[PDB]
Amino acid sequence: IGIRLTLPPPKVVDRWNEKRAMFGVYDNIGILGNFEKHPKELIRGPIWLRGWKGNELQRCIRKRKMVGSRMFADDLHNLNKRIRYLYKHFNRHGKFR
Amino acid sequence: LRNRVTDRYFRIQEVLKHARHFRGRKNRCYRLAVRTVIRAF
């Protein structure tokens, strides 16, 4: 029986965090910081998709050339296998050709 | 599981309440309850 008996503890959320209240601050640093920086130069994430959208296969290719020199051994092997699988899926399978 | 269905109970009970006056396993088992309440309607 998937339904639970007691209703869960209430998620108290502070909508006025230091992070929530000042979210989006220093966006539009490009148009009115007279273009010294770009808004894509403030995204803190992985080093390969830092201001680049791409695909799934495009993400795995970009990860493999930017980072794959310093990846773990099986994690690289699960990355070569996934580019080899997505190459056979996107180019050879599907509808619409 | 991200996004697994929580309210499956209320989709079963809207079918089962139209099948309580039935006979056999059709008044309880959802697989058998649907195939008779569809034919009941």
């Binding site: 998937g2 007691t6 869960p8 998620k11 | 309210d7």
Partner: peptide, 26 residues
């Protein structure tokens, strides 16, 4: 445990409905 709140709540307004049909108030 499933992640919800609304599904658990509507089960609370269904169980307390059954109480007042099993042991009704005076």
């Amino acid at each position: 445990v499933k992640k919800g709140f609304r599904a658990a709540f509507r089960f609370q307004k269904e169980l307390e409905r059954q109480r007042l049909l099993r042991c009704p108030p005076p």
